């Protein structure tokens, strides 16, 4: 899986860092930059799907284990393929849990192992491979973000609350990194359909098609986006032809925020 | 006692206001304001001495609550307390923060937790705790102090201008799930307030505080310094039924530093 | 008609002008200002409405006819209230013609007709009152605008593209005139229940309450807003209470610009 | 020919592409990018000499239109001819502006109206002349350029920075308005792009111009200038399938310039 016809040569041989890289988007970014010819390193809890995975797209892929609540186990991860490639050149902070859960029931543990789990894993990242690209004077960084926030959807706070952190975060750091030449965007997801949205339904197929449809109905285009549309968009974000784009949202929702 | 405006809003009159980091700067601003309009205002803060010298000045109408809003606990008891006390709280300002200055490659992940308690975990909590009163009434406010830097992308406090860029996505979000209830959230958005806290930090360099006092005046649009009154001015619409359709909004009063 | 119970001190004497005042919403800042207290001159196409309301609310209130595609007559209006009265203090720029139009079928006479009903008057009613503000060293304007365009709303594009205009052009104004002591901001109200919005469905009392309900189940709070929700946030933006504030939207949407 | 960047996107091969005010400067650079591309390339230009030129340079899969954006007859009439000539237009790129700078209080009524013809009218009528084709083959793309000016409050150019903002908006309307024909619209936003044109202005004062340079780079995050082909790497993804899911968006390309 390519996930484009596109040709980057920009991004042959580029060390590509991506978190929670075994399954869904993360997976299809993985599968994305190897393809352009990218050393794609990706951390993910789940050893045996990420196992499966460098194995099946082989050596310039590298799965290393990782609960990026444990920062010191994030920053042994990003020293390794330091070691292993050199310098990051490219960071995707896709890490996420996005659990429904409702506000009036949150305890003070669930908030924080959101906010670990969500947040602060991808400040952490870019902490780990800012001294690597400032010292070869290049690096890119995307943070993914989501319109889940900006349409105030109710029903999961530390997500979405999450997730607008990392809106500011985008733009501070690129002013705090940008003179050492890193760039940082944030790619911005609308409703992506995954085997795991769809996982959540296996015996309500009559369910899944009418929240299918609902996407449809309130989206500007008129069908329904996946894990290949992200990847169109990253491998756009990491590579030379957004050399000059810093500190911006790029939104791939097909009009799902504008209604 | 210090009205902060001359606008009269009998709206705010015998309301229940509750405001954290009241003892001091811009909270003290608010906890003035709302008592000068007849409301029954409780504030929290770290600074005992503070608080009680600030009651003191402010007498009956106020409720100065020791807590440190890192505890949550200590939070949720406090907000209990004004209930017990005073009935459903009608307007919260989430308020407390901590805007020291910290170089991205100097945050230790204590610092991190830290700072993401002091500025953004307690807001949450404290709407949480106040929201089931306000549900039960049918209407009530809150306002979650925000802040223009993490817009300008400005550098050099990455923890403090991500814990302000989450409170923005809270505000939209609370304001759908809460709305509902008849509570309405919004955020109150500070450009460069001068204080005397921040004033005090320069105490030996009269030049060095001129010199940025006049550089806030240049970038700004608007050709004068704000000051907390400004803040207060706001907060008083934002609370008052002047302002009853309003929600999940950003309202920005920055004489224009934002947009430059 | 006070629209509300606050006072503001800051407001009495003040020479506030309002176009499209006869009427709508812009009636209910008229009334609102003459019950602060200000000295309230108002422009409309409507003579006989503009009259009628000028008699009623009595010597404070002053209603010029003015055709706004007209910039002379513009012009002249405010220089007449400039004679009577000082220079303006307040300025709100609310004339506007908000009818359905399809894309496919705008000419370009009815483009041009629209721009200027909707967005040119506005720049020159700024123009006019700007030396007179200047000359004080204080004063301000509201233009306002509309979430239409911010949700992408269709069928209306001269209107929404005017008002996405008038976004820009408060930004701008507000660094260009802000060194003359002048504000500029924008009060961007939502679906504003009004006379002339209900006369439209005046044998369809099903349909009118059909899509009154429809405005609530897709706003935040679950009441209809009104004329008084407008003039309630033009009276903070006119008086002491918002000096500060400059180049910045304020929306009274009830939460309908967030879905 | 220049090729501004070295990716290749197969889905532009052969798609028909429609750029205003395409014989210099950033347009110059979309005509050549998609030619590059193995696009076929109409642009409309007022600089006869200039189109006929670069036409020349391109060869048999550009073709260069004579047009007055201002003209709106003239405009729908260059659309037609390439309809005829190619087939419905897969890409229509709104360029065409003039940013001349003017004093509020110097702008006429006739400035006025003419600067709204020059930076703005144009752009929606080329939407509405295209969009009926892209709409029977169920697919197509616009780009209209945006400016960061209005979003930095810039003054002094009230006329183009209006005109910029209102295309903002349009983009939003025309998304949701043409979405369900297949037809995506964003708004591409460049910063401070270095041209030979803003270059010629100061043939006299190398100094002035360096200084000036220099001034955007201090105030970027990003501490070189931008130019022409990163406006055009930007267009060539916004137009390929590679941005098929995204619509009604700005993507902004300034250098962090915007957020100061």
Redesign the interface.
Known sequence: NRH???????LADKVVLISGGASGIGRAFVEAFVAQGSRVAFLDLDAEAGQGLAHALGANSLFLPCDVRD?ERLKACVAEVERTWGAVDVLINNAARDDRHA??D?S?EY??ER?QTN??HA??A??AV??GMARRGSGAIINMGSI????????M?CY??????????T?????????Q?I?INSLVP?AIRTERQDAMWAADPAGLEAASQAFIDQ?????R?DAS?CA??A??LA??????????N??????L???
Request: charged share 20%; aromatic share 10%; glycine share 12%.
């Open positions: 484009t016809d596109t040709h980057y040569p920009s920062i506000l009036a949150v003070v908030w924080d906010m947040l602060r400040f952490f870019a902490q800012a001294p889940s926030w900006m349409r105030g959807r109710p029903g706070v979405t609350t999450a997730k607008a952190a990392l809106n500011g975060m733009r501070t750091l690129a002013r705090e990194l940008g003179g030449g760039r609308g989206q500007m285009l008129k069908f986006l549309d169109r968009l491998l756009f590579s030379d032809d957004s050399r000059g784009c810093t500190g911006q790029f939104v791939v929702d097909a009009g925020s504008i209604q």
